[PDB]
Design a protein around this ligand. Sequence first.
Ligand SMILES: O=C(O)[C@@H]1CCCc2c1[nH]c1ccc(Cl)cc21
Ligand SMILES: [Ca+2]
Ligand SMILES: [Ca+2]
Ligand SMILES: [Ca+2]
Ligand SMILES: [Ca+2]
Ligand SMILES: [Ca+2]
Ligand SMILES: [Cl-]
Ligand SMILES: [Cl-]
Lengths: 360, 356
Amino acid sequence: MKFTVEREHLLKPLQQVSGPLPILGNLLLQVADGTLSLTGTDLEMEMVARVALVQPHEPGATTVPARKFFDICRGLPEGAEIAVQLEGERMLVRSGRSRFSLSTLPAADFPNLDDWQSEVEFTLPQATMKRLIEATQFSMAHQDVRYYLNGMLFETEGEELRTVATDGHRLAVCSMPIGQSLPSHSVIVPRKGVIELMRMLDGGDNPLRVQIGSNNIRAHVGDFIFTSKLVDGRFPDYRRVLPKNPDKHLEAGCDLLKQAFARAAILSNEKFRGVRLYVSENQLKITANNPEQEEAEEILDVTYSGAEMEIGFNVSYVLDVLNALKCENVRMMLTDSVSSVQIEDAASQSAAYVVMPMRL
Amino acid sequence: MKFTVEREHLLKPLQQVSLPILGNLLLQVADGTLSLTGTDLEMEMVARVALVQPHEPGATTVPARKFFDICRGLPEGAEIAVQLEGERMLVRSGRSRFSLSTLPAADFPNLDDWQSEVEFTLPQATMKRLIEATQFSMAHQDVRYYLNGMLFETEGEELRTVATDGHRLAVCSMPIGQSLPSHSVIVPRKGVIELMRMLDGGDNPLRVQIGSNNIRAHVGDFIFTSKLVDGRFPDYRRVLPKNPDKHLEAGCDLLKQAFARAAILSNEKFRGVRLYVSENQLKITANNPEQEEAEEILDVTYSGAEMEIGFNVSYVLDVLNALKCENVRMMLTDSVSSVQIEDAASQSAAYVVMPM
Ligand SMILES: O=C(O)[C@@H]1CCCc2c1[nH]c1ccc(Cl)cc21
Ligand SMILES: [Ca+2]
Ligand SMILES: [Ca+2]
Ligand SMILES: [Ca+2]
Ligand SMILES: [Ca+2]
Ligand SMILES: [Ca+2]
Ligand SMILES: [Cl-]
Ligand SMILES: [Cl-]
């Protein structure tokens, strides 16, 4: 196995196949039919990056320490030529008067995911999948014993793809039309897989092809192919959590709302983070207090014409939402003091967020 | 106690000054000035803010982080009205209202009074230079406590910093244009951090006062005071190689990046690399327990005798990173002695690394 390649034709592929038993700490390298393939895996998911070889090359395959190899390539100067050749049990890397000899492990020992058949497929712009994931990712659970929440639901229905995330306390949903007729279907992508998928998306003109099997998901964009197992479990139904008829709409500028809440949060309970809202004609008042009896109060002009009411909620969750929206204006959809709140960009129903009420 | 001040005039001060009462800031309105004081009993920062609007005298103590976070949290151009009521300190701006808990000003600790013995003035940029040139070589948590801080030495008209952990050393000397006595104090690491943090970067000069057990720095409307560390700091003069007459010169960034690449295949714990010097060439090698190997060859300016020597590469990289320069000079003795490293264009800082 031998190849010579420009440094910058390796770095993005290396970035993608690297991670965030010891062979899982290596990258599989393969030279075949004019192409260098690099694969990383943690047994649950895998990334394959292909790079065209325009310079003389010789076929073969090995595995090499991922972090050391990446760091060597990155440490070489911009534009450097990197010549690689297998020499016994070692991989030799040379560029200029810099030389390196890395340990290998056999390509035969690099683990594969089981083979599987694709049952649902669709293509969509990368920007669209990026918006879907970014809209909801922050509401996924981390390491909950309810293992099926440590991930994101992907739901196809009609011509729409939808993502849902919840940690069992708060919920995020995003839906976007993708212009293809789809079966009604849903799967749970593990949280790490979501993150890896997200980082594969450069926001470019390459279309994204998604293929979903009964136990796996695959995403293809240009020179990259990502494959992950699905979480084998039942996701909760997002539909029963959405408020039925939130008939009291408050609208206000996102930043003003966010800044008022961030100030109020400073004097809220450090563990439970409850803040109270008092809504009246075109006016919102936010209060917070803590066990030390310190108190915050914010009054803002907003748009509102419903009946007066008050509601409490977790200010950390509400701030998470307002930071995810990054938009001009926000809509808070209210029912009463004992019902959840749904929050949206005032100018788009594509993403919605639900936060539980708190009795304070 | 009442004041009303622009957000812009509180923020920098609050940031500079930021057992329960140690978590609070002491606020004092007296003689048309707001004083803000923060302390951890070892050191203290005081900021003075002139009050151009109506105000009433008095003092209290309030949670530092919360007050800072509320003031920062308010919008550009906010006016911040403050008054003691209770028990509580009220902060108001726009239609944002806050009630904070207090501890009595009477309880706020004072550093003991002390007398200035040595005093001088120098530019902010010179103190920045002195500290950044050496800070990275201080020990962290060494049982020789005085190595966890930084020596500040006056000699002739020079102010000098020295930092060392036993394994490598940094020294930097700068002229300050005043006749100074010969004196040395050791400033604790925390104090060195704060001393740096108060510069700022404007053209306000720094005024330093040194006592037998304290150092004080005045810049602008801020006064920082720290206790000193006792103990006998080593003599940089005995650490400098007596006659390192083998002189190698190389590009700083070229040299750094070569070491940084070799370091990848050095032992993770011991970090050793080998240097082979010969006529106008440097070879750097490294290897690890997995028998992986790195080799770098660089063109350098060298016409001394050949030799080889081992070093902890993290120590060398620390030096090269702290030098912000075009070319470096490595000054060698033999395979079992230290190396001295300087900017090829300046002698005002020097670095010493022990061989492995
Ligand atoms: O080890 C010792 O007993 C003294 C005192 C601490 C600093 C230091 C010593 N000897 C040194 C030799 C070299 C360097 Cl870089 C620093 C030091
Ligand atoms: Ca992977
Ligand atoms: Ca449609
Ligand atoms: Ca294009
Ligand atoms: Ca209040
Ligand atoms: Ca070595
Ligand atoms: Cl004022
Ligand atoms: Cl010097």
